[PDB]
């Protein structure tokens, strides 16, 4: 009844990327990130900017022809936080309130079998 | 406690202690005579044998060694003597 | 007696050439002038004749090898690589 995409929300700290793609993952529609909706450089990660970005992404997705979406929330991962940023929740809700349909949500943070040295020194990023 | 007979300890308190830590030390192991029902004669196997003791005429098995007591190999008949 | 303290074979160079240069020579001139075990007859008779050439006295087999030792560290792991790679073929 629908036609699906995959939503690929990557909400770190310092930013939130929405961008939906085709079900293949190759062809992307509707990229808009979270720091394109504010220019204050601290509120790039804030959930209001994530709501505005997800609203624009849902507008372009509803225009192109994608009426349902398969979200994959992501954090930075690797040797980074492996915790999603503040704008990952709101963007998800702002992707579901808009009129886009939601299926099969999961979490795709890249997590090592642990690996290369984490940045910050041995005494740490102390300040 | 504070008064007890350390020279005549109860047998239930002595059957549980380590074989070196009883009043006079003595082994908790034994011997046993085994006959395999194919042959006729009996042989005297230690309880903690450590070797594959085979029967005298038909050399097959009577006990395979283990961590502690030997395991008699399921077709046997044994008497502790 | 013990004739020299640390120069060993390189005391033929005397006082010249720099001590760290006579130390690297002493590491290899001990190796190239030593007798090694023959693989074939099991005797300790293999002596170098020229760089990379190692001849055994009795059974007279000449084996090619490293310039200062019979088997270099590189070519030993090569022989066990090709040993490993060959048994992936017959299996």
């Amino acid at each position: 009844s629908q036609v699906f995409g995959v939503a690929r929300i990557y909400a770190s700290f310092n930013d939130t990327f929405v961008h939906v793609t085709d079900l293949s993952g190759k062809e992307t529609i509707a990229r808009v990130t979270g720091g394109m909706k504010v220019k204050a450089d601290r509120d790039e990660s804030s959930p209001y900017a994530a709501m505005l970005a997800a609203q624009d992404v849902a507008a372009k997705c509803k225009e192109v022809g994608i009426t349902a979406v398969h979200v994959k929330i992501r954090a930075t991962g690797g040797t980074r936080t492996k915790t999603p940023g503040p704008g990952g929740q709101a963007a998800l809700r702002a992707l579901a309130r808009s009129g886009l349909r939601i299926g099969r949500i999961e979490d795709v943070t890249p997590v090592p079998s642990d690996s290369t040295r984490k940045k910050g020194g041995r005494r740490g990023r102390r300040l | 406690v504070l008064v007890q007979d350390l020279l005549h300890p109860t047998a239930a308190s002595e059957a549980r202690k380590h074989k070196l830590k009883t009043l006079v030390q003595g082994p908790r192991s034994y011997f046993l005579d085994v006959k395999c029902p194919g042959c006729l004669n009996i042989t005297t196997v230690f309880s903690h044998a450590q070797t594959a003791v085979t029967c005298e005429s038909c050399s097959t098995i009577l006990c395979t060694p283990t961590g502690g007591k030997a395991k008699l190999s399921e077709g046997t008949s044994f008497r502790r003597k | 007696a013990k004739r020299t303290k640390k120069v060993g074979i390189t005391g033929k160079y005397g006082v010249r050439y720099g001590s760290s240069l006579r130390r690297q020579v002493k590491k290899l001139e001990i190796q190239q002038h030593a007798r090694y075990d023959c693989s074939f007859c099991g005797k300790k008779t293999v002596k170098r004749g020229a760089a990379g050439i190692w001849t055994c006295s009795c059974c007279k087999k000449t084996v090619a090898g490293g310039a200062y030792t019979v088997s270099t560290a590189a070519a030993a792991t090569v022989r066990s690589t090709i040993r490993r790679l060959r048994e992936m073929v017959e299996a």
Binding site: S24, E106, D107, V108, T109, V111 | - | -
Partner: protein, 147 residues
């Protein structure tokens, strides 16, 4: 992966299986032993593929003590059994039949029916299978799976 396209109808073939990370992550609970075993192996038609497995020890339902770890030779025994079962079930006929094994998950049943004489071993899965060599394109063998 998408193999052949016939006029607004792009046909595919099996390219791999993997768990979702919430399922794989919820099984790794503390106070028990995790067991991993993988085999890199060929099939009937030459799909060379690495197929994984996971297992976890559990409590017997009369067990009082907190954890029930294995004993590190039970782990080696279970890994041996798992690998032998996997390299038995692969080099049967090809990944058509291997996916028709993986969908009803008969492999887990064989694992728990063989390792139960070693250790209790809850929550057994196959957890991944990844392709690392495809034999050839073979369009007829492809369209045998598209009626």
């Amino acid at each position: 992966r998408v193999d052949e396209v016939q006029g607004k109808n792009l046909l595919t073939n099996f390219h791999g299986m993997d768990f979702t990370t919430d399922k794989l992550r919820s099984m790794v609970r503390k106070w028990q032993t995790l067991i991993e075993a993988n085999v890199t192996v060929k099939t009937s038609d030459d799909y060379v593929l690495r197929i994984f497995a996971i297992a976890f020890t559990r409590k017997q339902a009369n067990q009082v003590k907190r954890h029930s770890y294995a004993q590190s030779s039970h782990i080696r025994a279970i890994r041996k059994v798992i690998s032998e079962i996997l390299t038995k079930e692969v080099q049967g006929s090809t990944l058509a039949q291997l996916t028709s094994k993986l969908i009803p998950e008969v492999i887990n049943k064989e694992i728990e029916n063989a390792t139960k004489d070693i250790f209790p071993l809850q929550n057994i899965h196959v957890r991944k299978v990844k392709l690392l060599k495809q034999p050839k394109f073979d369009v007829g063998a492809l369209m045998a799976l598209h009626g």
